[PDB]
Symmetry: C4
Subunit: 314 residues, 4 copies
């Protein structure tokens, strides 16, 4: 009559595929269309370890790795020296905004770099990022930032795939060889190809014209990750769920803007000194539930079709 | 011109399939995606009997059968001795919560078991269930519950497919052979396989990480029912419609939480002594409309493709 | 360069099919799922006549034809003698409700039948319908209604495909051969087959258990219309758009409940003497826009794939 | 290990198609159904020029080309001589409404034509359009409008594919050979074929009976543009996004109604003298982001599958 319980693990082989969808099946522009994080769930797996064991090391750029995938956005309502210092102490990084004079921006970088476990350090000084535009003036700005000790620059554009930005990337790589460059914003595979070819060390993802973020992250990273170019998901995550899903779909780090506005160190959500640990633990538990011991493993399992997904009805 | 009325039953054969969808067609993760109960309807069939004839006997675990598929959730706002006693008198069962000391929980079980037609009885005493965690302490807790006469234990976890829970299942089966074990929570076929292999007598279904309940119930039970492992649908049903659909998709019993908060016997919806009969009759009428004389028949008809469904637009 | 304007009608042949969807393509339970009237639009065609020319004659049952497809529902808030008289004068019909004693119901019928162009007449007296249940008592009720001059009886059930209703149909046909019987409610092809086989002269369409109305109307009528059994759409139309779409999908007449509550003749929307003409003209204009000169033509064009449809996003 | 950055542009060839959907893939009535502008996004491309270089010249009719695709609707709340004069000065055109006597309408045209860079001019006088019906009286009306200097007439109908309108088109072409005729409204390929065959110089797109605008625009223009018959999108655009998408899908110009109600020159949104430049620049930037240097190029790129799209979930 009924099947033997002892055969339950073996009986999974009478099925053509694993329960749920692979990421490739989920992210089908032809059938499901463009997806946001709220449009799907990640299915749980097997828990064989405590969440405390989960490693969250994350590539920010080709040469920079953080102990956590959290990056503060270059918004004048979010990141200044205070934010950048405290994000780095907590294992992420801060991208200092450029709605300020070049001198003011360099002094903020200098404050971070002069500041004295999970901590993001270069020099042994705290890591610092900063945003610039691709206007002629930003060349002088960048030179000042580099003089102040900048580790990574983010080129700040709604539409990054431009001759202006490509030229800026090429100039930076030639002029400041030790500086890591994150280009963007991009939402398509073609945009990604163009800026990778130009010499980008990382990409920033998000945008009549635009693209649903989940679909953007998947299609850009599916291409970029083949070139070892890590991507930042910058679509305005609001919670641990959004962060887990951004990474699931291919992002290496996640940019936090509105999420961090209102915290103590922003220029009330309280202190980042509590909030980032809360997110860090939340992401450890997400990985635990999914059955992966690191974000590197998480990426590998998803790309192999081991991690499964389900599309959600409205 | 027009076809003869006398040929109407025979003309149904010029059609390739029955009107509406089979459950397999409905629950397609590739086309429709993940479904909740509100996303579909069960199509009516042929009424050849009064609703009063409908039998609602339901398997709780491999060895325990109830006269009705109603199970009270182990929530400190829902089930205590009062609830558990009255659920059992009405042909269902109550799972006593464990947000309390082990001694307090055992005394609540003892109250149920010492209490003196559709009634759920073991000993001739009322059936009682209780929830525990899978922490080391819960081993001592369970021993106390068993001493008090416990018939079935529910392992209480958001994500039940863990080494901790698997170990707990194996220990219980070896230590308390006469005790029935319901494992969970699970939402996937793989999770179900793992806990069935470990020795579960039943599964509890429901859950960044999770799954729409209709899809969860279908895919877990489609696997579990082959092993004679009955599943409890625990996604928070709110009405008779939800209960009918949970069972349609494969659930053997349904867990009621919020539905029963506010009733007289919970620790105003009035008395369960009225409400459960109301639900019992409602489910009889649902079965009647669908054209099935029992929940066993209902399961068989659905799995054979006889019972039909329709997906609902928003 | 550009194509000649003179060839525009001929160039439509380089296309594999007409623009938009056929009704069969629209009403696909596998792809689109279950549809309501709000989920689609009828595409316009070619206007070659004034709307005043549009004929709205509609089959109520195998033997009864009305000058307009409007039927008042058997609700004690909608149809009594006043409503039924005035609906018949305007070319539709009224189904008198049965939330009343059999004597009271017969007197209401008698009032209609004794009352002295588009007018619905049998005898030369106004046509009258009435609802009954399928309980033993309704046999005596029906005998009284028939004595009072009843032309058509509607069997009033949420789920009409029952042994009780089948028995009632067979008894009526044998006992009152001149009486037309509308059976229901049904939502599926199988239910329709059963009640047609029993001897129904018409079907009433609409209903955990149920079906989206557009899909119900299409699938029931696609079957029933082959047997010359006209169907009433009873899903609670609210406007001219709903009425046009119900008929487009296969309904022969449309039942109005809530639409007519609040009018002067119901037991403020004003007088039916104004409202029905307003709907009558609205439906003429709908037919005009679609390019059909009658509801008979409308049915034929839709079933041949000439009339086209478009599914609407939310 | 990782792929070389230098190969990034070449690696795009291992993919079967470009990222995102072609317009033909997007506008599938069978899979996605009927779409509105809010249901999709246009994907960004490569920026190789400043937005100021973007040319927005747009065909209004076979013989009339405007410097911008903006047309004011013939609504008595939107277009009169003031509106029409100022729209023409800004490189678009105004269609004067006909909820007025024929004499009053002709005097409004006369005011435009007698008025003394991007400016729309015929004679060297400002271009003027006007709406008429297809009633017998409108023949005398049109003669008066033509005497006043009318350049283009719009036949004003909810459903333009009628013998009345076809007759009117043929009469106009024969009687006033120098007058350009825009026929409509149409929403289908068949309606378009009929009015093109009759002699229309342009079509106006938009409409129980109707069609989602994005789908209407695509299917009508995909046919009409082959005959060099430019189409006006008249579905009530509200913003720059709507305007960009209407043109993306095939429209040559866009009609603005509600958008322009409340402006200074309508019979507060301020002056059109500011608002139209704002829209003009917005559309230049949209084209820039997409990577096209003109609306002619935009049409060509979209029809070739170069410009890509993404369907948006709710």
């Amino acid at each position: 009559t009924y099947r033997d319980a002892a055969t339950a693990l073996e009986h999974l082989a009478t099925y053509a595929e694993k329960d749920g969808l692979s990421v490739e099946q989920l992210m089908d522009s032809k059938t499901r269309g463009g997806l946001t994080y709220n449009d799907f769930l990640v299915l749980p797996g097997k828990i064989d370890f405590p969440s405390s064991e989960v490693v969250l090391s994350s590539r920010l750029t080709k040469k920079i790795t953080l102990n956590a995938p959290f990056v503060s956005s270059p918004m004048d309502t979010v990141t200044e020296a205070d934010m950048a210092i405290h994000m780095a102490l907590l294992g992420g990084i801060g991208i200092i905004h450029h709605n300020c004079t070049a001198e003011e921006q360099a002094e903020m970088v200098r404050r971070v770099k002069k500041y004295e476990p999970l901590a993001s350090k270069s020099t042994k000084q705290l890591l610092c990022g900063a945003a610039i535009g691709t206007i002629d003036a930003d060349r002088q700005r960048l030179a000042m930032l580099v003089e102040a000790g900048l580790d990574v620059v983010v080129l700040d554009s709604s539409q990054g795939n431009s001759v202006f930005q490509i030229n800026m990337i090429k100039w930076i790589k030639e002029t400041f060889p030790d500086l890591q460059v994150i280009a963007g914003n991009v939402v398509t595979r073609e945009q990604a190809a163009s800026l990778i070819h130009a010499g980008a060390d990382g990409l920033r993802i998000g945008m009549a014209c635009g693209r649903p973020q989940g679909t953007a992250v998947y299609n850009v990273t599916q291409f970029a990750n083949q070139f070892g170019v890590p991507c930042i998901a910058d679509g305005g995550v609001q919670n641990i769920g959004h962060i887990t899903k951004a990474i699931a779909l291919g992002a290496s780090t996640v940019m936090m803007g509105g999420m961090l506005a209102g915290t103590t160190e922003s220029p009330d959500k309280g202190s980042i000194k509590k909030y980032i640990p809360y997110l860090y633990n939340g992401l450890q538990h997400s990985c635990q539930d999914i059955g992966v011991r690191s974000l590197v493993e998480f990426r590998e399992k998803v790309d192999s079709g081991s991690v499964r997904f389900e599309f959600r009805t409205p």
